Design a protein around this nucleic acid. Sequence first.
DNA 1: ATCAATATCCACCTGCAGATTCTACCAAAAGTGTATTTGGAAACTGCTCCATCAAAAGGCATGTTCAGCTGAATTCAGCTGAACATGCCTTTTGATGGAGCAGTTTCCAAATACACTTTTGGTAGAATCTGCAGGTGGATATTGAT
DNA 2: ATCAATATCCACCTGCAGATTCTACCAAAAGTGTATTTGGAAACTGCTCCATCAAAAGGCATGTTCAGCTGAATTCAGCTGAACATGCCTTTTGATGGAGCAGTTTCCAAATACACTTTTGGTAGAATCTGCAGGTGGATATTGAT
Lengths: 98, 98, 106, 105, 87, 81, 93, 93
Amino acid sequence: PHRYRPGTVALREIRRYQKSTELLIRKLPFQRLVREIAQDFKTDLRFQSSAVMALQEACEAYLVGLFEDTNLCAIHAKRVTIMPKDIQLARRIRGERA
Amino acid sequence: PHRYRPGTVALREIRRYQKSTELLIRKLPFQRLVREIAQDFKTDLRFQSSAVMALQEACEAYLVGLFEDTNLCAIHAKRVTIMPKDIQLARRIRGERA
Amino acid sequence: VKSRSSRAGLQFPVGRVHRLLRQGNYAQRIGAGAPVYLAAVLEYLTAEVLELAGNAARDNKKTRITPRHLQLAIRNDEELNKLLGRVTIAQGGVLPNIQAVLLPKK
Amino acid sequence: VKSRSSRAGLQFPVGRVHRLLRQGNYAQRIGAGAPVYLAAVLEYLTAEVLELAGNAARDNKKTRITPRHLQLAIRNDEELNKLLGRVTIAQGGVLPNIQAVLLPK
Amino acid sequence: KRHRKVLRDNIQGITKPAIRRLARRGGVKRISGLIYEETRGVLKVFLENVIRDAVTYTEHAKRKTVTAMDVVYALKRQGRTLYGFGG
Amino acid sequence: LRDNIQGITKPAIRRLARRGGVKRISGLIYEETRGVLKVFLENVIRDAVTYTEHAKRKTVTAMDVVYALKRQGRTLYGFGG
Amino acid sequence: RKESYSIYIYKVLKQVHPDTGISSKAMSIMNSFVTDIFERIASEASRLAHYNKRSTITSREIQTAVRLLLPGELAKHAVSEGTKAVTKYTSSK
Amino acid sequence: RKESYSIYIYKVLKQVHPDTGISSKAMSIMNSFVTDIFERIASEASRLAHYNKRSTITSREIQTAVRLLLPGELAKHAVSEGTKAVTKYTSSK
DNA sequence: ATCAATATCCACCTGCAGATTCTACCAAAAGTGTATTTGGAAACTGCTCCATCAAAAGGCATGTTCAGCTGAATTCAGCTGAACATGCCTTTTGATGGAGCAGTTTCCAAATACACTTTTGGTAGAATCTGCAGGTGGATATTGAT
DNA sequence: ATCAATATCCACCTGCAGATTCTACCAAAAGTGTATTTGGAAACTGCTCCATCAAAAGGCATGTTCAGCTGAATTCAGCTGAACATGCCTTTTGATGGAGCAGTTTCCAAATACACTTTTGGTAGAATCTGCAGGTGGATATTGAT
Ligand SMILES: [Cl-]
Ligand SMILES: [Cl-]
Ligand SMILES: [Cl-]
Ligand SMILES: [Cl-]
Ligand SMILES: [Cl-]
Ligand SMILES: [Cl-]
Ligand SMILES: [Cl-]
Ligand SMILES: [Cl-]
Ligand SMILES: [Mn+2]
Ligand SMILES: [Mn+2]
Ligand SMILES: [Mn+2]
Ligand SMILES: [Mn+2]
Ligand SMILES: [Mn+2]
Ligand SMILES: [Mn+2]
Ligand SMILES: [Mn+2]
Ligand SMILES: [Mn+2]
Ligand SMILES: [Mn+2]
Ligand SMILES: [Mn+2]
Ligand SMILES: [Mn+2]
Ligand SMILES: [Mn+2]
Ligand SMILES: [Mn+2]
Ligand SMILES: [Mn+2]
Ligand SMILES: [Mn+2]
Ligand SMILES: [Mn+2]
Ligand SMILES: [Mn+2]
Ligand SMILES: [Mn+2]
Ligand SMILES: [Mn+2]
Ligand SMILES: [Mn+2]
Ligand SMILES: [Mn+2]
Ligand SMILES: [Mn+2]
């Protein structure tokens, strides 16, 4: 029976995904989310596929960017685990609101 | 002999200066500083008094805001004392660094 | 002879707004209704912050609006605050606010 | 017939840049030197990020520059990183970077 | 003659492992159990704002199809400039 | 003789912190603060003076400073624009 | 000779609090406010017209620009006032 | 009928890196980059002409705009290239 | 300081989707020749702006004492990472019908372009007012000790 | 929480200088009335491109078990940063005189905008080329247990 200690596979995954550039959210679900939000803002809407793709590029870049700042806020608190508290702090300093 | 406990006068001052709108850096030393820094970019320069005043306004506003975010970072770390560490974190998350 | 501000039912100068639009390099032509609309919008927003600042001065037991009153007005209102989130008001100071964790225990 | 680009010793299209200046609503009139200068600067900056990106491609055993190479080139260069500090490069990913405190021992 | 099925709850399509992956690219090593819901909230706000402005550009163009340019312009309004999509 | 940035004194920095809600201040904060302050002023003044030079002037006007501040995303109200 | 929005701002001040005054510094701040919002709305309208290969900034451009620039409620009221002034102006010969 | 900077970008690519190619996604990003920098510089130039009650954007405006927008070294080299292009251009008939 | 159990690399292979080259029109530069502007470039203002001067005033620097806070150490419960089994559902491929971009004409409602004619917004002195800085005297808050 | 004792605030009134409002005139915009253009809306319509749809299969999402090591709680000591009294010096300020420049004219030479009229450079597909993504399998390294 073999078993990597907790943290090892996590760091492995960090290296893995920092090496690649592929989108990390599944395509179809994100497309559905977009159509849902848009629909709530306006019905009968159509989307160019490249527009959905742009939206996903923006969303993932923003979320990766936010997670870096979050990580810095957890490490500032002498922690290794990111928490909603951290996200909230990062977004407060960034000037984002609620 | 009378003595207020540490923290008391500090809170007093917080309320006092949060009530006022006076510039808090003394004017002449600041004008000195401004003229020096400016001297490094172009020599034999003159300054409108309203220009120096605008600079000091913008500046003190900037530093007070940064002190807010800094304080939030110190409180995030279960502290009550702001440290250079805190200013660093705030400025990194603000996008003024890294 | 009646000014376009009067014809639009506005205090703000429709003609001047038109001139500024032309001289601001925005487009090659400026429609007739655009300066009216813009002037109306600017006047509404002005009325808004002037009202809230008036209230803030009334609260301070003052008759004349100051930078401080404009700041207290703007920062205490969610939407004006958002609209001016990256604007600094000279001689406006800050809202009194102390993080609870900094207050004495008993 | 003499291309203005040629007369300026430039690869970037001086005439096109002048036209875009005219059509962009920036000013009533556009001086003849402005499009020359602007196209020159644009070409220079293009050359700089293409240089660094080409380096990234070579470092990664690649003949062809990708968005990834562009991202690495830009983020690893302080000046370009600052110039484009609020720009997002599609399919660019991020710089490998792990906070030291996250490593074992 | 037929309408699409109702769209609802699609934010849950933003799965736990996907959020996990995004955190990994952010260089995050350990994740609290309450992070995923917060992330979904924050993401939803982000998307709402960008899509709102985009669709506003669509409306103004008197179109019914949101274009990649609509999203690019929308993103630029919010200081999140995007390269790669005809920007 | 003392440096000009040192003319930005400890108690003034303290007062600014107070307006920002800070209750307790580490002794290393003041030098840090002076540094940040210097960077801010360098950036703003550099831009402003650039406006000045373009205007073929020798007097930095309040508008130059306001325009520079608007460039740095720090719009100031109250000085001519 | 220099010009500003001072007298219009004061007029609206009287229309909104009849017995309230305004200091000079405050008046400057209000001028900067009007100038700012002017520049935002105009710039966005310009962008809008450009995106659709149009050469005229019409009331519609100002409207969309308002919708994009002002937060929800304020935007709604701004659109209201705008349409009102334009219909009233079309209603004067 | 869509025009881009692609052939010019490719020319410069071959100049700095003769045996290196570029993928279409990367070329698209390059096109965005050029249009972006174009817009920043032209906007700043517009603004600068405006502030000084001038109606013409000359090479001088472009230059100051460049010094405002670009960080140190980048700016210095950009200014160099711009000046040389301009002098070379004006010497020709 | 050693062995297993995986994960990590690096080279070598090969057809394919994606990039580079080849050809062919057309909008877009570029070339001429009038036709305006525009922003210098000298000679002078009026005006803020710099430099002293000269006190007085607070405000800053210094040093002592010590409360209380921060950081180190220790503990443990329970959250969260790793591994595994199960089966859903996203991903891929290819086709099809038609909604909805755009591309082109066809034309007026609307804007521009002058030429005057009016009227309003600014400027420099004129004419009152709002707070601010002070001053008690009355409670509140803060701190040490029955 | 109550006994006393500094200091802190808060209220109500007060008097005045520093600003604010009000008044009185002249260029400069704003408004009119024509004479033209000109943008862009309406009405087909040639065609990408989006929305479904189908169907197979495997890449992953989901859910469980379980134990390691992380976060949170607790304690404690020492040393940092606050409060405060002391005494010195730099900032403030307040004209004052001088003069360095912004802010404005006033000319023209150079530069820019027009309006046509040729001349090419760049673009949209088709016709060739070819890196590189995936797929394997053996060497190297990494990790975790005795
Ligand atoms: Cl800054
Ligand atoms: Cl020029
Ligand atoms: Cl010659
Ligand atoms: Cl000239
Ligand atoms: Cl599959
Ligand atoms: Cl001299
Ligand atoms: Cl060719
Ligand atoms: Cl050819
Ligand atoms: Mn000097
Ligand atoms: Mn209109
Ligand atoms: Mn080379
Ligand atoms: Mn090279
Ligand atoms: Mn093919
Ligand atoms: Mn399942
Ligand atoms: Mn149809
Ligand atoms: Mn009048
Ligand atoms: Mn009048
Ligand atoms: Mn008048
Ligand atoms: Mn008082
Ligand atoms: Mn008072
Ligand atoms: Mn009383
Ligand atoms: Mn007086
Ligand atoms: Mn037309
Ligand atoms: Mn256990
Ligand atoms: Mn721990
Ligand atoms: Mn616990
Ligand atoms: Mn002790
Ligand atoms: Mn004493
Ligand atoms: Mn002189
Ligand atoms: Mn491979």
